[PDB]
Amino acid sequence: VYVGWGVKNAPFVPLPPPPVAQEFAWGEVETQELELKPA
Amino acid sequence: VQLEPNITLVLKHLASCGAVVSAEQQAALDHSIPIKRIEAGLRSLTLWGRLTTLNGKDYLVAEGYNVASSKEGAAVYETKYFYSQDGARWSDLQPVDSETATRCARIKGMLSGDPAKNYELELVFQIPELAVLRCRVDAIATATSVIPTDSTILNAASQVVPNRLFAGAAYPEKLESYQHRFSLPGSGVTLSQDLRGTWAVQYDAFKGVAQVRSLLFPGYFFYYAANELTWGSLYVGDGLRNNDLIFML
Fold this sequence. Notes:
Entry title: Radial spoke 1 isolated from Chlamydomonas reinhardtii
Chain A: Flagellar radial spoke protein 4
Strand content of chain B: 25-35%
Largest sheet of chain B: 4 strands, antiparallel
Organism of A: Chlamydomonas reinhardtii
PDB class: structural protein
Oligomer: part of a larger assembly
Number of strands of chain B: 14
Keywords: complex, mechanoregulation, structural protein
Radius of gyration of chain B: 18 Å
Number of strands of chain A: 0
Shape of chain B: globular
């Protein structure tokens, strides 16, 4: 039989704040024309 | 009304709350509590609780006191504790020092059954098991010791004696009906001037019986029967308070 409060005798760790997401990688860059041949 | 709490009444009203004692231990208490009471000069001596151990020889603890005085604005009951592994023979439970109690506080988990063990703390320190047991028992006793409000009264020579003209606690399903023994009878300090969620009360109005459970120490139970006007408290479990209480409420 079981008699008592419904708790477990393991050490309790309250869940920390959830993780933050991550933004897109920087393979997203602007291509540019060849500039000049300044003298 | 009652002069001393009755062990059989305590075991009968706390049977639901899970506070139980074995048959042999029950009979042995019945036959052995008076012997230890009369061996000393104690006017009162009753079972205090049953702490659980690792080998299987649970620690039965009883406490007693002779006279109840009022001193420095509080009721100071000079108590003496005894322990046992069987209900037959009662041994003294020596009081501990201050720093020894501070070190006591750092031992967790149930203490083993053998009273000859030693725990190692930290320069190293050796802590006997009886010291840990006494530390836990005095902590629980200081924290929670319930009697119905105004069930005692002062008198000549300023000794806290029972109140033979106790009318009965009105509205006994509320915490204002019960108080810690240390609180003086005249003062209005009761079981409601402590934390808001460390006491639970259940009440049966038809049978007129109230059960008060301590949530800081999940093993402390108390009953108040209004029709018979009889109250009593018990502790069953290891002497650990649940510090992670808030997440539980």
